[PDB]
Amino acid sequence: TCPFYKKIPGTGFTVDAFQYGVVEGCTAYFLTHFHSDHYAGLSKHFTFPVYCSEITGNLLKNKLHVQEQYIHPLPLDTECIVNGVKVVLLDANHCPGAVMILFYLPNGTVILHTGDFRADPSMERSLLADQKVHMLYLDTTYCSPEYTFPSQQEVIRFAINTAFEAVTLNPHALVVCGTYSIGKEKVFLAIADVLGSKVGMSQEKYKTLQCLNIPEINSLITTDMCSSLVHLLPMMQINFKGLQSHLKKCGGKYNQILAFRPTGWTHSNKFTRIADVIPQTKGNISIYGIPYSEHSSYLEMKRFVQWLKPQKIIPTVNVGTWKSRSTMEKYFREWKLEAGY
Ligand code: NI
Secondary structure (H helix, E strand, C coil), rough: CCHHHHHHHCCCCCEECCCCCCCCCEEEEEEECCCHHHCCCCCCCCCCEEECHHHHHHHHHHHCCCCCHHECCCCCCCCCCEEEEEEEEEECCCCCCCEEEEEEECCCCCCEEEECCCHHHHHHHHEEEEEEEEEECCCCCCCCCCCCCCCCHHHHHHHHHHHHHHHHHHCCCCEEEECCCCCCHHHHHHHHHEEECCCCCCCHCCCCCCCCCCCHHHCCCCCHHCCEEEEEEEHHHHHHHHHHHHHHHHHCCCCCCEEEEECCHHHHHHHHCCCCCCCEEEECCEEEEECCCCCCCCCHHHHHHHHHHCEEECCCCCCCCCCHHHHHHHHEEEEEEEEHH
């Protein structure tokens, strides 16, 4: 059965609700982004209308085989009517293709569903500026003040400088970057660009990147691992065993690996500046965990919500415990008393 925080009252619509079978009364299923917790249940046998971005549409067609007749892509920043209701898709600053959805209900209520997002001041000059929002369905992944991390630009600066230094000291070092989903592509793309290399990967991961509308992609990536000195590997292989095993396969081309594991937040954030991050090292293998987040920090979330001033907030993450729900409700009430809405 479909929970309440995935239904849009007064419409036939759901959001990110494909794991419950046929939802009673649902005439249109919205997909915010192509992350497995959110698409859970879609396949080539799905026969209802799916509304989403162009990029999410390319991934449902080519990776999940959903038939073309049921894929409904919408452009961003554009007023659209779906089954009698005005909707707008906005960039969520999450992974490629990810959106927030503005719904203009027939009774005059306006609802924003953030999907997954990384709040930014630039969102204060989208189509959100123009009018009031009564209900906010909010990505609360990091809704507690301990959750701090740097900007994506500082993190990428660190990774570029680390890789360029190492390969300039040792032209025989290989760089490896872990992945398990779409998102965070800037980590491996910026490193390969400083090194003057394409990024090497499996046929399956190449397929996924080819769906993403990245300009000049054919100039940036390849399936020919032998010619490339930046390789992608599944995240589960980013450990001393998996990496040893990978260097053997390269046939004595390389004598050192430097690897990156993008994570979300970890507790080493609470004591260490990005500058001061150090790897784990065994022999000729070094592994850096870097806090590249595609979700809002506490401070970014708080700024967005204090600016939007919604009448009601419905969290969509961390909803499973009484303590989580109570904690989030306390912070929504401080934010509201501090800003005066
Ligand atoms: Ni996500």
